UniProtKB/Swiss-Prot annotation:
Stimuli inducing this protein: Up-regulated in a number of hepatocellular carcinoma cell lines and liver cancer lesions, as well as in patients with hepatocellular carcinoma with a lower survival rate (at protein level).
PTM annotation (N6-acetyllysine): residues: 19, 144
Protein name, as recorded: La-related protein 1
Start and end residues of each stretch annotated as Interaction with mRNA: 1-149
Effect recorded for residue 126 to A: Strongly decreased RNA binding
Region of interest called Interaction with 7-methylguanosine mRNA cap structure, as start-end residue ranges on this chain: 83-126
Length: 149
Protein backbone atom coordinates (compact mmCIF):
# COMPACT_ATOMS: atom_id res chain seq x y z
CA UNK A 1 0.00 0.00 0.00
CA UNK A 2 1.32 3.50 -0.80
CA UNK A 3 0.95 4.66 2.81
CA UNK A 4 3.72 2.17 3.67
CA UNK A 5 5.81 2.54 0.50
CA UNK A 6 6.09 6.34 0.65
CA UNK A 7 7.43 6.00 4.21
CA UNK A 8 10.45 3.98 3.06
CA UNK A 9 13.75 5.86 3.03
CA UNK A 10 14.19 7.68 -0.29
CA UNK A 11 10.98 5.99 -1.45
CA UNK A 12 8.83 9.11 -1.78
CA UNK A 13 7.72 10.67 -5.06
CA UNK A 14 5.13 13.32 -5.83
CA UNK A 15 4.14 11.06 -8.73
CA UNK A 16 2.91 8.38 -6.32
CA UNK A 17 1.67 10.78 -3.63
CA UNK A 18 -0.57 12.63 -6.08
CA UNK A 19 -2.34 9.40 -7.04
CA UNK A 20 -2.50 8.11 -3.46
CA UNK A 21 -3.77 11.46 -2.19
CA UNK A 22 -6.54 11.65 -4.79
CA UNK A 23 -7.94 8.16 -4.22
CA UNK A 24 -8.14 8.95 -0.50
CA UNK A 25 -9.83 12.34 -0.88
CA UNK A 26 -12.22 11.05 -3.55
CA UNK A 27 -13.28 8.06 -1.44
CA UNK A 28 -13.80 10.53 1.42
CA UNK A 29 -15.73 12.96 -0.79
CA UNK A 30 -17.70 9.99 -2.17
CA UNK A 31 -18.31 7.90 0.97
CA UNK A 32 -18.43 10.83 3.41
CA UNK A 33 -16.72 11.99 6.57
CA UNK A 34 -15.25 9.19 8.65
CA UNK A 35 -16.34 6.57 6.11
CA UNK A 36 -13.14 6.18 4.05
CA UNK A 37 -10.62 3.70 5.41
CA UNK A 38 -8.16 4.89 2.76
CA UNK A 39 -8.50 8.36 4.29
CA UNK A 40 -7.46 6.97 7.68
CA UNK A 41 -4.32 5.52 6.09
CA UNK A 42 -3.58 9.05 4.85
CA UNK A 43 -3.98 10.51 8.35
CA UNK A 44 -1.52 7.86 9.53
CA UNK A 45 0.93 8.49 6.69
CA UNK A 46 0.95 12.23 7.41
CA UNK A 47 1.54 11.60 11.12
CA UNK A 48 4.94 9.98 10.43
CA UNK A 49 6.06 11.56 7.15
CA UNK A 50 5.75 15.11 8.50
CA UNK A 51 8.14 14.29 11.36
CA UNK A 52 11.28 14.10 9.20
CA UNK A 53 9.77 15.60 6.02
CA UNK A 54 7.71 18.55 7.24
CA UNK A 55 5.70 20.14 4.43
CA UNK A 56 3.54 23.17 5.19
CA UNK A 57 0.98 22.30 2.50
CA UNK A 58 0.60 18.73 3.77
CA UNK A 59 0.44 19.88 7.39
CA UNK A 60 -2.29 22.47 6.81
CA UNK A 61 -4.35 19.89 4.91
CA UNK A 62 -3.67 17.28 7.60
CA UNK A 63 -4.90 19.63 10.33
CA UNK A 64 -7.92 20.93 8.41
CA UNK A 65 -9.26 17.48 7.53
CA UNK A 66 -8.54 16.10 11.01
CA UNK A 67 -10.54 18.91 12.61
CA UNK A 68 -13.39 18.38 10.14
CA UNK A 69 -13.69 14.69 11.05
CA UNK A 70 -13.44 15.56 14.75
CA UNK A 71 -16.26 18.10 14.53
CA UNK A 72 -18.58 15.24 13.52
CA UNK A 73 -17.28 12.74 16.10
CA UNK A 74 -14.67 10.89 14.00
CA UNK A 75 -11.43 11.41 15.90
CA UNK A 76 -8.80 9.17 14.29
CA UNK A 77 -7.55 12.09 12.20
CA UNK A 78 -7.28 14.37 15.23
CA UNK A 79 -5.67 11.51 17.16
CA UNK A 80 -3.04 11.11 14.44
CA UNK A 81 -2.50 14.87 14.62
CA UNK A 82 -1.84 14.89 18.37
CA UNK A 83 0.52 11.94 17.85
CA UNK A 84 2.46 13.89 15.22
CA UNK A 85 2.53 16.83 17.65
CA UNK A 86 3.71 14.83 20.66
CA UNK A 87 6.39 12.77 18.89
CA UNK A 88 7.22 15.13 16.02
CA UNK A 89 8.03 18.09 18.27
CA UNK A 90 10.14 15.79 20.45
CA UNK A 91 12.38 15.03 17.45
CA UNK A 92 12.37 18.41 15.67
CA UNK A 93 10.97 21.29 17.71
CA UNK A 94 9.21 24.10 15.84
CA UNK A 95 7.74 27.09 17.65
CA UNK A 96 4.90 27.60 15.17
CA UNK A 97 3.91 23.93 15.37
CA UNK A 98 4.22 24.03 19.17
CA UNK A 99 1.65 26.84 19.28
CA UNK A 100 -0.74 24.92 17.04
CA UNK A 101 -0.22 22.03 19.46
CA UNK A 102 -1.34 24.20 22.39
CA UNK A 103 -4.28 25.70 20.49
CA UNK A 104 -5.65 22.30 19.47
CA UNK A 105 -5.03 20.81 22.93
CA UNK A 106 -7.09 23.59 24.54
CA UNK A 107 -9.84 23.03 21.97
CA UNK A 108 -9.78 19.28 22.61
CA UNK A 109 -10.07 19.64 26.39
CA UNK A 110 -12.79 22.30 26.16
CA UNK A 111 -14.72 19.81 24.00
CA UNK A 112 -14.68 17.32 26.89
CA UNK A 113 -11.75 15.20 25.66
CA UNK A 114 -8.49 14.18 27.30
CA UNK A 115 -6.60 12.41 24.49
CA UNK A 116 -5.00 15.65 23.32
CA UNK A 117 -4.22 16.83 26.84
CA UNK A 118 -2.49 13.54 27.68
CA UNK A 119 -0.36 13.81 24.53
CA UNK A 120 0.68 17.36 25.40
CA UNK A 121 1.46 16.33 28.97
CA UNK A 122 3.42 13.40 27.52
CA UNK A 123 5.40 15.80 25.33
CA UNK A 124 6.44 17.97 28.28
CA UNK A 125 7.34 14.79 30.17
CA UNK A 126 9.67 13.26 27.55
CA UNK A 127 11.04 16.26 25.64
CA UNK A 128 12.17 17.74 28.99
CA UNK A 129 12.25 21.15 27.27
CA UNK A 130 12.34 23.78 30.02
CA UNK A 131 11.16 27.40 30.06
CA UNK A 132 8.38 26.62 27.59
CA UNK A 133 5.93 29.53 27.33
CA UNK A 134 2.63 27.71 27.90
CA UNK A 135 -0.74 29.35 27.32
CA UNK A 136 -2.29 30.37 30.68
CA UNK A 137 -5.45 28.37 29.95
CA UNK A 138 -3.41 25.26 29.12
CA UNK A 139 -1.51 25.57 32.41
CA UNK A 140 -4.79 25.35 34.33
CA UNK A 141 -5.94 22.31 32.34
CA UNK A 142 -2.57 20.59 32.77
CA UNK A 143 -2.92 21.22 36.50
CA UNK A 144 -6.28 19.46 36.47
CA UNK A 145 -4.70 16.62 34.48
CA UNK A 146 -1.66 16.17 36.73
CA UNK A 147 -4.14 15.77 39.59
CA UNK A 148 -5.83 13.13 37.41
CA UNK A 149 -2.68 11.39 36.16
C1 LIG B 1 7.18 6.01 25.03
N1 LIG B 1 6.24 7.12 25.02
C2 LIG B 1 5.02 6.98 25.57
N2 LIG B 1 4.39 8.15 25.41
C3 LIG B 1 3.12 8.71 25.74
O1 LIG B 1 2.96 8.68 27.04
C4 LIG B 1 1.77 7.80 27.31
C5 LIG B 1 2.20 6.53 27.69
O2 LIG B 1 1.16 5.60 27.57
P1 LIG B 1 1.24 4.41 26.43
O3 LIG B 1 2.61 4.37 25.81
O4 LIG B 1 0.94 3.07 27.07
O5 LIG B 1 0.12 4.72 25.27
P2 LIG B 1 -1.21 3.78 24.99
O6 LIG B 1 -2.07 3.75 26.24
O7 LIG B 1 -0.78 2.38 24.64
O8 LIG B 1 -2.08 4.42 23.75
P3 LIG B 1 -1.50 5.59 22.74
O9 LIG B 1 -0.63 6.54 23.53
O10 LIG B 1 -2.66 6.36 22.14
O11 LIG B 1 -0.63 4.89 21.52
C6 LIG B 1 0.67 5.33 21.26
C7 LIG B 1 0.78 5.76 19.81
O12 LIG B 1 2.22 6.46 19.56
C8 LIG B 1 2.44 6.35 18.29
N3 LIG B 1 3.90 6.30 18.04
C9 LIG B 1 5.04 5.69 18.41
N4 LIG B 1 6.03 6.24 17.68
C10 LIG B 1 5.51 7.17 16.88
C11 LIG B 1 6.16 8.09 15.85
O13 LIG B 1 7.33 8.04 15.66
N5 LIG B 1 5.36 9.02 15.11
C12 LIG B 1 3.94 9.08 15.34
N6 LIG B 1 3.13 10.02 14.60
N7 LIG B 1 3.33 8.19 16.33
C13 LIG B 1 4.16 7.22 17.10
C14 LIG B 1 1.79 5.02 17.89
O14 LIG B 1 1.18 5.13 16.68
C15 LIG B 1 0.74 4.73 18.99
O15 LIG B 1 -0.62 4.62 18.38
C16 LIG B 1 0.99 7.79 25.91
O16 LIG B 1 0.15 9.03 25.78
C17 LIG B 1 1.90 7.79 25.07
O17 LIG B 1 1.43 8.41 23.81
C18 LIG B 1 5.17 9.02 24.78
N8 LIG B 1 5.01 10.44 24.34
C19 LIG B 1 6.10 11.12 23.64
N9 LIG B 1 5.94 12.50 23.22
N10 LIG B 1 7.34 10.43 23.38
C20 LIG B 1 7.49 9.07 23.81
O18 LIG B 1 8.50 8.50 23.59
C21 LIG B 1 6.35 8.36 24.53
Amino acid sequence: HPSHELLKENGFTQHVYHKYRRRCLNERKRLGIGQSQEMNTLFRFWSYFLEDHFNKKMYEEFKQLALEDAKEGYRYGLECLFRYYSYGLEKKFRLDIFKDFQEETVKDYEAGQLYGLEKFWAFLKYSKAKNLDIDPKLQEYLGKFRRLE
